[PDB]
Design a protein around this ligand. Sequence first.
Ligand code: SZ7
Ligand code: SZ7
Ligand code: MN
Ligand code: MN
Lengths: 138, 137
Amino acid sequence: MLSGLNHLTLAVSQLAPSVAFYQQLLGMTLHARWDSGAYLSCGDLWLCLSLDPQRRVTPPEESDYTHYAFSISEADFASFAARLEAAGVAVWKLNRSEGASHYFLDPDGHKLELHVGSLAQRLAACREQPYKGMVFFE
Amino acid sequence: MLSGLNHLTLAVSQLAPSVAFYQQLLGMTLHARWDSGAYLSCGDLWLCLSLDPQRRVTPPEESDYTHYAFSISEADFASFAARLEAAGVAVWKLNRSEGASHYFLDPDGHKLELHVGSLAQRLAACREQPYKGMVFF
Ligand SMILES: O=C(N/N=C/c1cccs1)C1CC1
Ligand SMILES: O=C(N/N=C/c1cccs1)C1CC1
Ligand SMILES: [Mn+2]
Ligand SMILES: [Mn+2]
């Protein structure tokens, strides 16, 4: 039986800018680095950066909607978004759903998000206003 | 301050086969589905499958090493991997370069993994068998 997300691995084209982004800009803890990657943590998340010459710096119009959202409190959201803005980090989408969300790109174009709110919160909102074709499972 | 992964969203080309994969084959919990997506959980993980006309069914030699690993116990690992194999699930990697792992593909070619062990355990294993040039902080 699967018990959760064990780790997220992102392929990166250049290790040093990716470490700078995740450790210094985003505040994740760097536990180890080697010639072709790094291990960080973000709360319970184990993140691996893997240096990969196949990684392309990918514009957001060229990738699909697959994306990775990090948790932040409502109280901290606006100042963290402003930090990303000051750093010139590109936005790939505006928020139109429930709960605060800031949609930003990593140095290789990985699609990231800051989001406030849980799955339970989303399901409660959806129960009140279901999406087209929505059905729930108890 | 960031505190972990809020959710993983995977773009999918065909919603129903993807839901079936994650719910029926991988055993994740399906909470809701709608015309353009589904919400599942795997322990505390919130997984969203999002129907996306832009998603390509992608062979593993065409995509980079980005991948998503799910936790499984030592006792369950081998029989779960063998069941995925017997069900015809495609693979993408054989060499266990990061401990006890099984590397497999979802219907759209998303790179998945079964892994036994935490980050702390991986760091301890690496102190004995480090990756080339490894430094620990
Ligand atoms: O809300 C979350 N997970 N929820 C998991 C669930 C498992 C079973 C029901 S809800 C993540 C913090 C964002
Ligand atoms: O699962 C079912 N219904 N669930 C309804 C729910 C409404 C709101 C949350 S669950 C039916 C037996 C097939
Ligand atoms: Mn999202
Ligand atoms: Mn892995």
